[PDB]
């Protein structure tokens, strides 16, 4: 009947709706049960159901096994929309444990070998300097983001560029200072540079 509920989700969703159902289900059942539901739903071939499952993972992410599964397995997801939810779920984890305390995990995700793991961290925290801790410590965001300025993945690079661009709008000087040190010697860093410097002198 857990299998039945999933089949029902596949029918309903195949037509925020996924997020709202996930939140409701998470709030309505014990965590042990919902974890089993989340993995079952994550095996669905219906991408909306996997989105639902990944929201659930976010709510359950204090379980390190869930967090690891997000890091290593959800990051393999073939569907771009599911990848967006991965970034939201990762943001959800950081919010649940507090941004300052999540720093070690933010760093680990940013340095992961899976390009999708790296993007989910970069994109999920946007706008970085609107988050607790990074709001007070802008360079902590700039420095982490900028470290991926020469990322092999364009997917990652777009995120990096935009994350720096977000920050430039509120901390123009800090961003200019960081950018001043860049040597535009590759197509990679130049892509990032163009995105990040729109609003800086």
Q: Mind giving me the DSSP string for the chain? A: -HHHHHHHHHHHHT--HHHHHHHHHHHHS-HHHHHHHHHHHHT-SSHHHHHHHHHHHHHTTTSHHHHHHHHHTGGG-S-HHHHHHHHHHHHHHHHHH-TTTTHHHHHHHHT-SSHHHHHHHHHHT-SGGGSTTTTT-HHHHHHHHHTTTT-S-HHHHHHHHHHHHHHHTT-HHHHHHHHHT----SHHHHHHHHHHTTT--
Is the CB of residue 108 less than 8 Å from the CB of residue 141? no
Q: Which residue has the tokens 């219906």?
A: 46
CA 70, CA 94: separation in Å to the nearest integer?
A: 13
Q: Which residue has the tokens 């569907």?
A: 79
Write down all domains in the chain, each with its CATH number in brackets: 1-83 (1.10.1240.70), 84-201 (1.25.40.290)
Number of Cβ within a 10 Å radius of residue 179: 19
Instruction: Check the CA dihedral 4-31-133-108 and report its sign.
Output: negative
CA distances from 39 to 52, 113, 160 (A): 11, 23, 30
CA 174, CA 163: separation in Å to the nearest integer?
A: 14
Number of Cβ within a 10 Å radius of residue 150: 16
> Which two three-digit tokens encode residue 1?
């009947």
> Which residue, among 142, 147, 157, has the nearest Cα to 195 in the 3D structure?
157
């Amino acid at each position: 009947s857990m299998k039945q509920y999933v089949a029902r989700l596949e029918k309903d969703f195949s037509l925020k709706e996924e997020e709202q159902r996930a939140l409701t289900d998470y709030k309505s059942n014990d965590g042990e049960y919902i974890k089993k539901l989340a993995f079952l739903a994550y095996q669905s071939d219906v991408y909306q159901v996997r989105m639902y499952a990944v929201f659930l993972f976010g709510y359950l992410s204090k379980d390190k096994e869930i967090l690891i599964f997000m890091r290593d397995e959800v990051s393999k997801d073939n569907n771009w929309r599911v990848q967006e939810v991965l970034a939201k779920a990762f943001d959800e984890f950081c919010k649940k444990i507090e941004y300052k305390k999540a720093l070690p995990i933010i760093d680990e995700w940013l340095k992961s070998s899976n390009l999708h793991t790296r993007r989910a961290a970069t994109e999920g925290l946007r706008i970085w300097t609107n988050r607790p801790y990074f709001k007070e410590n802008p360079n902590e965001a700039i420095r982490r983001i900028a470290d991926l300025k020469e990322d092999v993945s364009e997917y990652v690079r777009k995120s990096v560029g935009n994350a720096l661009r977000d920050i430039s709008k509120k901390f123009p000087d800090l961003v200019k200072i960081e950018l001043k040190n860049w040597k535009l010697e590759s197509k990679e860093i130049n892509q990032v540079y163009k995105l990040a410097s729109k609003f800086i002198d």
